[PDB]
Design a protein around this motif. Structure first.
Motif, PDB file in Angstrom:
ATOM      1  N   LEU A 192       0.824  -1.201   0.000  1.00 57.21           N
ATOM      2  CA  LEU A 192       0.000   0.000   0.000  1.00 57.21           C
ATOM      3  C   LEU A 192       0.857   1.249   0.000  1.00 57.21           C
ATOM      4  CD1 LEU A 192      -2.731   1.268   0.047  1.00 57.21           C
ATOM      5  CD2 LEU A 192      -2.704   1.158   2.515  1.00 57.21           C
ATOM      6  N   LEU A 193       1.946   1.254   0.772  1.00 55.27           N
ATOM      7  CA  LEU A 193       2.856   2.395   0.782  1.00 55.27           C
ATOM      8  C   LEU A 193       3.519   2.587  -0.573  1.00 55.27           C
ATOM      9  CD1 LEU A 193       4.330   4.593   2.397  1.00 55.27           C
ATOM     10  CD2 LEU A 193       6.075   2.894   2.898  1.00 55.27           C
ATOM     11  N   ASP A 194       3.841   1.489  -1.249  1.00 53.18           N
ATOM     12  CA  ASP A 194       4.490   1.577  -2.550  1.00 53.18           C
ATOM     13  C   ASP A 194       3.549   2.151  -3.600  1.00 53.18           C
ATOM     14  OD1 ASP A 194       6.321   1.330  -4.579  1.00 53.18           O
ATOM     15  OD2 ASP A 194       6.185  -0.851  -4.687  1.00 53.18           O
ATOM     16  N   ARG A 195       2.299   1.699  -3.616  1.00 54.82           N
ATOM     17  CA  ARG A 195       1.352   2.160  -4.618  1.00 54.82           C
ATOM     18  C   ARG A 195       0.788   3.535  -4.305  1.00 54.82           C
ATOM     19  NH1 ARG A 195       3.075  -2.155  -6.251  1.00 54.82           N
ATOM     20  NH2 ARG A 195       4.544  -0.572  -7.019  1.00 54.82           N
ATOM     21  N   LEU A 196       1.123   4.109  -3.154  1.00 58.24           N
ATOM     22  CA  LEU A 196       0.558   5.376  -2.731  1.00 58.24           C
ATOM     23  C   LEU A 196       1.606   6.467  -2.605  1.00 58.24           C
ATOM     24  CD1 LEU A 196      -2.258   6.366  -1.800  1.00 58.24           C
ATOM     25  CD2 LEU A 196      -1.807   5.389   0.379  1.00 58.24           C
ATOM     26  N   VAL A 197       2.892   6.116  -2.595  1.00 59.83           N
ATOM     27  CA  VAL A 197       3.935   7.121  -2.759  1.00 59.83           C
ATOM     28  C   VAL A 197       3.998   7.580  -4.207  1.00 59.83           C
ATOM     29  CG1 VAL A 197       6.412   7.474  -2.729  1.00 59.83           C
ATOM     30  CG2 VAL A 197       5.309   6.560  -0.773  1.00 59.83           C
ATOM     31  N   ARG A 198       4.001   6.635  -5.149  1.00 58.36           N
ATOM     32  CA  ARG A 198       4.020   7.024  -6.549  1.00 58.36           C
ATOM     33  C   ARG A 198       2.680   7.564  -7.023  1.00 58.36           C
ATOM     34  NH1 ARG A 198       6.285   4.124  -9.957  1.00 58.36           N
ATOM     35  NH2 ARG A 198       7.417   2.635  -8.637  1.00 58.36           N
ATOM     36  N   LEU A 199       1.606   7.361  -6.257  1.00 60.98           N
ATOM     37  CA  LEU A 199       0.356   8.054  -6.551  1.00 60.98           C
ATOM     38  C   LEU A 199       0.515   9.550  -6.350  1.00 60.98           C
ATOM     39  CD1 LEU A 199      -3.071   6.761  -5.406  1.00 60.98           C
ATOM     40  CD2 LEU A 199      -2.698   9.154  -5.249  1.00 60.98           C
ATOM     41  N   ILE A 200       1.315   9.946  -5.366  1.00 60.13           N
ATOM     42  CA  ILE A 200       1.488  11.360  -5.065  1.00 60.13           C
ATOM     43  C   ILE A 200       2.370  12.023  -6.109  1.00 60.13           C
ATOM     44  CG2 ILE A 200       2.468  12.904  -3.349  1.00 60.13           C
ATOM     45  CD1 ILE A 200       1.491  10.753  -1.307  1.00 60.13           C
ATOM     46  N   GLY A 201       3.422  11.340  -6.539  1.00 67.52           N
ATOM     47  CA  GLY A 201       4.230  11.833  -7.635  1.00 67.52           C
ATOM     48  C   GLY A 201       3.529  11.635  -8.959  1.00 67.52           C
ATOM     49  N   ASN A 202       2.521  12.458  -9.218  1.00 64.63           N
ATOM     50  CA  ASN A 202       1.658  12.335 -10.377  1.00 64.63           C
ATOM     51  C   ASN A 202       0.972  13.682 -10.555  1.00 64.63           C
ATOM     52  OD1 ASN A 202      -0.484   9.563 -11.463  1.00 64.63           O
ATOM     53  ND2 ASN A 202       0.196  11.396 -12.542  1.00 64.63           N
ATOM     54  N   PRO A 203       1.101  14.323 -11.716  1.00 65.91           N
ATOM     55  CA  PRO A 203       0.400  15.598 -11.926  1.00 65.91           C
ATOM     56  C   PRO A 203      -1.095  15.454 -12.148  1.00 65.91           C
ATOM     57  CG  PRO A 203       2.396  15.491 -13.224  1.00 65.91           C
ATOM     58  CD  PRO A 203       2.151  14.112 -12.720  1.00 65.91           C
ATOM     59  N   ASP A 204      -1.617  14.242 -12.274  1.00 71.15           N
ATOM     60  CA  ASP A 204      -3.026  14.042 -12.564  1.00 71.15           C
ATOM     61  C   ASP A 204      -3.874  13.826 -11.320  1.00 71.15           C
ATOM     62  OD1 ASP A 204      -2.666  14.300 -15.325  1.00 71.15           O
ATOM     63  OD2 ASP A 204      -2.244  12.161 -15.579  1.00 71.15           O
ATOM     64  N   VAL A 205      -3.318  13.993 -10.122  1.00 69.74           N
ATOM     65  CA  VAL A 205      -4.095  13.780  -8.908  1.00 69.74           C
ATOM     66  C   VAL A 205      -4.667  15.107  -8.443  1.00 69.74           C
ATOM     67  CG1 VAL A 205      -2.810  11.743  -8.279  1.00 69.74           C
ATOM     68  CG2 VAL A 205      -2.092  13.944  -7.388  1.00 69.74           C
ATOM     69  N   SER A 206      -5.835  15.026  -7.831  1.00 70.36           N
ATOM     70  CA  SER A 206      -6.628  16.202  -7.530  1.00 70.36           C
ATOM     71  C   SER A 206      -6.313  16.708  -6.130  1.00 70.36           C
ATOM     72  CB  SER A 206      -8.110  15.877  -7.680  1.00 70.36           C
ATOM     73  OG  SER A 206      -8.516  14.950  -6.689  1.00 70.36           O
ATOM     74  N   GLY A 207      -7.099  17.669  -5.678  1.00 68.49           N
ATOM     75  CA  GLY A 207      -7.089  18.105  -4.304  1.00 68.49           C
ATOM     76  C   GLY A 207      -7.426  17.027  -3.290  1.00 68.49           C
TER      77      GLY A 207
END
Lengths: 363, 363, 363
Positions: free
Chosen positions: B50-65
């Motif tokens: 979960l930590l692995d799939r959610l750190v690289r979720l943050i490094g993403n310009p397509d994520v919202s507020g």
RNA sequence: ACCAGA
RNA sequence: ACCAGA
RNA sequence: ACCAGA
RNA sequence: ACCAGA
């Protein structure tokens, strides 16, 4: 020494708030139905559409007294769940009866909003004289996300609440001061910097807050309700109580600065006998200020009758001394206009002289 | 001497926190559902995935507020057994309703995680603009031992909690300061030195912590829960309370350094009468600071309305004296930017003069 | 004089330990099963065989994080009758769950030890990279007398407990210091001089004590249990509390030596006003040090969050004065590295100057 | 964080 | 709002 | 009534 | 009885 306590009790009764609840009810004025378009339903989408159709309603020279005040009370309470139980919670004004009407979204109406009267709403909500944003590339500010609308509404309210700070004291020269608060909430990331409503939209509202009195009683008495909210306030409500530090005591600075410079510095020119009677009618105004409660910093925003009592005309000599101490100490006191028919500049020059004599003169 | 205690009580009421619990409940804002992906089940393996799939979720310009704030609240609470009863324990924010969803590991899904909605999780978790570690030879940080994940999670959190220290005060010039704390936790062997998240990943988070307010209320109010843990804290929680010494009072240094240099040095230039009124409105801000409780060093991190009251604009002369004492004593005060519209450098030069005159001048 | 006690109370609350027991239990981390091989049965022979098979287990590059920490907790508690009720007596660490297993001797197993799983123990306990004694003529240290094992175990523990003294403060430059304690316990006839474990065995353990935190919490919290033993302590336990005088306050010498040289000498350069604020934030750190209890000399061995508060960065001027007094008085202070980003050598040269001026200058 | 300490 | 802080 | 106030 | 008093 029986004259002394007979004198002090004489000034703690003529400078005393009158006791109340003596009117049976025959003072209440003729009422006035006002129209406050509350957001319709739980959904976020119609209250963003309501904000859009009601900001440009204000930027319109064809709107009246009550229609504009009800438009402002309609948008100054969009930040809560169920705004209908906020307006009737706050308004204890005796001259205005809230008749608030629910507004729901639709695809049949021209403006997009009906009343829960499908086309009757279009005569309620509807180019160089329509007030709108400065970046007038904007057509609509209708959004669909909750945190989007939370930042757009927080942007619109943060430049209506800063109007209240000096709508009644310095209405004309408020344009440079209120910009310095807009710069404050832009670098705090409280508001969005793009959605700055223009000079002509705000001059509709600043003229409105100045000219009627029941709009200010709604704006003051919800601020007093924001303060009582115990825990973490909601973020638009925290912003309103953040703007509030500029709205409190706004119009009492012939009394606050008299305390700050005349009293608290304690130069040797307070033991003058000519001030000795005026330190007691300023002592009794500090007793009166804190027993008026939490409505006391707003007495000239609410424009009640007791702000004639805190006027500098009752202590015209010790006030002028404090303007003399005041303009000599700070750069910021140089912009304060103190033009009154009781100025007596011989104590203003005595006020400056005590500062210049006590330059490196540690007591 | 009746004016004196009538003056001191006047400053212990206008400079007093307002009493609360007067709102019946009609201040609460429109809610906002946020999505916090909590670790699924007892096993260590899925919370490292979960930590692995959610750190690289943050490094993403397509994520919202909301998706980014829920991603950060998802990883800032992975360090506890059962993170679900931590989020609903901490969050008393009125503008955000936590709808937290359990994430369990799988071999059917693309990312490897499903929701306890097998492929619906893949649109939740999913090259030069994806933020990741600086040693970008790394592909995945999924591990299987408990002490491995305890050191990887402690590495990721220790460079998100140091973002909070000056995300809102000096956001742009925080890159050199936060590295000096990364060097601190590397030689303490708190973190691993290899897994340094890059400039572009942290600038997503530092911009996020600055721009929304309910993420900071979660980050502050769990720090306040870490402090209350009586015994030996768990080691990631000890690290968060260790980073905390840089987060406390961060944005009140026009008040802390006014106390440290203007008050506590006690040069003979405090008996000036122009300071005598401003030592009392700084005495009452020290009474107010300790009766706000344990949420008082975070008043500008939480950005409440009471940090306008601790501003240096209410004591513009005695603050400038303390900047004059301050920049003359330490090398470190030379980097402090104090640019305000109330500076009055005649007392800044008087502040430096008392230090230079009192060089070898033991009292 | 109302500012003075309002100032002193301001520093006795921001420099105060936070009150506890506010966490309901949602701070406790994910657990971690560790394996501590306790001695099996009453007989002396199997706990000497356990010590033999577990010293050479540590001198092995193939042992992990938890297997090495459980090996050290296995040998740091062999000196008591029934070590099983010592580990669960001491360990209040929230990140490590002790699963301790009894080890009994056998003649069937390869290593000679089974678990009370006959050959499964052989994968638990099993040339130039195996750490062992310096006199590597030694093959085994299994004995059969009780006073023999009491002197061999006392030799092995006395060079693991001296590792703790500067495993976290000066890890690399600890090789010359820890030898001077090995010379101390050789001429006291505490240990045997022959059984000196080599540089490579101790560098496994010193790196281990530095890199994990639950091993130090076991090593600290049994020392605190040794001290509470009222009567004559057992002789290995007396030796551990004898090594303890080098482990206490190890990492607080920017605070202990600030007290010893800056405060207690009382040169006339303490009445400087620039120190007057920093003698009060050092007075409050002496109030805080003794109300933390008996866990206070170990705050940087335990690496809690409160050793950032005793840092010299909060008193950067009076600390530098005490390094100036310090390196001029003793030969031993010349080896102390004090390299910090707040050094300000103008008070270090003022610290040396007060010593050189006061050479034969009896007060 | 870094010294010396029968 | 902006410093330094094992 | 008029100033300045992250 | 006569002034001034946002």
């Amino acid at each position: 020494a029986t004259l002394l306590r007979s004198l002090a009790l004489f000034k703690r009764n003529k400078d005393k708030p009158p006791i109340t609840s003596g009117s049976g009810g025959a003072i209440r004025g003729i009422k006035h139905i006002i129209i406050v378009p509350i957001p319709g339903d739980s959904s976020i989408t119609t209250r963003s559409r309501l904000l859009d159709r009601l900001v440009r309603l204000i930027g319109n020279p064809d709107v009246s007294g009550p229609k504009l005040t009800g438009a402002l009370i309609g948008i100054l309470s969009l930040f809560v769940e169920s705004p209908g139980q906020l307006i009737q919670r706050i308004t204890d004004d005796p001259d205005v009866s809230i008749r608030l009407l629910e507004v729901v979204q639709s695809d049949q109406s021209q403006s997009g909003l009906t009343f829960a009267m499908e086309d009757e709403a279009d005569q309620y909500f509807s180019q160089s004289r329509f007030g709108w944003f400065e970046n007038k590339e904007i057509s609509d500010i209708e959004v669909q996300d909750p945190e989007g609308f939370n930042m757009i509404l927080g942007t619109i309210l943060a430049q209506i609440w800063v109007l209240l700070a000096k709508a009644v004291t310095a209405p004309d020269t408020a344009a440079d001061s209120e910009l310095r608060r807009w710069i404050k909430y832009t670098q705090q990331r409280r508001v969005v910097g793009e959605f700055r409503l223009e000079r002509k939209w705000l001059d509709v509202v600043r003229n409105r807050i100045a000219e009627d009195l029941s709009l200010r009683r709604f704006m003051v008495a919800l601020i007093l309700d924001i303060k009582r909210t115990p825990g973490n306030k909601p973020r638009i409500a925290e912003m309103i109580c953040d703007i509030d530090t500029y709205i409190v005591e706004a119009g009492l600075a012939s009394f606050i600065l008299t305390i700050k410079f005349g009293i608290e510095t304690m130069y040797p020119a307070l033991g003058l006998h000519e001030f000795a009677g005026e330190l007691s009618t300023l002592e009794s105004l500090m007793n009166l200020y804190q027993q008026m409660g939490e409505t006391a910093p707003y007495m000239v925003i609410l424009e009640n009758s007791i702000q004639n009592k805190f006027s500098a005309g009752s202590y015209p000599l010790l006030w002028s001394y404090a303007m003399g101490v005041g303009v000599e100490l700070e750069n910021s006191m140089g912009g304060l206009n103190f033009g009154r028919s009781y100025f007596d500049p011989a104590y203003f020059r005595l006020g400056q002289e005590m500062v210049r004599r006590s330059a490196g003169k540690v007591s």
